[PDB]
């Protein structure tokens, strides 16, 4: 089992400090960054098998998802 943070629809990093362990080994974690024309910025992360090393075909524009196979890789 891999350990990664878990903060959906969050804009405050100070609050994004909830580390949770995944279900089973093999699953990968990813971090999404949302930054609109304004200043507001959200942060999301997930954990599953379906995690493309690089999301270029989709998940782009405003929200970019970055895959990673490291413990607490979605810490930042």
From Swiss-Prot:
Interacts with CHRNA4. A lipid is attached at residue 76 (GPI-anchor amidated serine). Induction: Down-regulated in gastric cancer cells. Residues 2-76 form the UPAR/Ly6 domain. It comes from the Eukaryota. It is found in: Cell membrane. The gene is PSCA. May be involved in the regulation of cell proliferation. Has a cell-proliferation inhibition activity in vitro. May act as a modulator of nicotinic acetylcholine receptors (nAChRs) activity. In vitro inhibits nicotine-induced signaling probably implicating alpha-3:beta-2- or alpha-7-containing nAChRs. Keywords: Cell membrane, Disulfide bond, Glycoprotein, GPI-anchor, Lipoprotein, Membrane, Signal. One of its GO terms (molecular function) is acetylcholine receptor binding. Glycans are attached at residue 21. One of its GO terms (cellular component) is plasma membrane. N-glycosylated. The keyword Membrane applies. One of its GO terms (biological process) is negative regulation of ERK1 and ERK2 cascade. This is Prostate stem cell antigen. Disulfide bonds join 4-29, 7-16, 22-47, 51-67, 68-73. Coiled coil: none annotated. The keyword 4Fe-4S does not apply. It is a lipid-anchor; GPI-anchor. Highly expressed in prostate (basal, secretory and neuroendocrine epithelium cells). Also found in bladder (transitional epithelium), placenta (trophoblasts), stomach (neuroendocrine cells), colon (neuroendocrine cells) and kidney (collecting ducts). Overexpressed in prostate cancers and expression is correlated with tumor stage, grade and androgen-independence. Highly expressed in prostate cancer bone metastases. Expressed in gastric epithelial cells, mainly in the isthmus (at protein level). Not detected in normal intestinal epithelium (at protein level).
């Amino acid at each position: 089992m891999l350990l990664c943070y878990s903060c959906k629809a969050q804009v405050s990093n100070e609050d994004c400090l909830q580390v949770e362990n995944c279900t089973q080994l093999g699953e990968q974690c990813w971090t999404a960054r949302i930054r609109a024309v304004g200043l507001l910025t959200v942060i999301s992360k997930g954990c599953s098998l379906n995690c493309v090393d690089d999301s270029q075909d989709y998940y782009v524009g405003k929200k970019n998802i970055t895959c990673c196979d490291t413990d607490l890789c979605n810490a930042s």
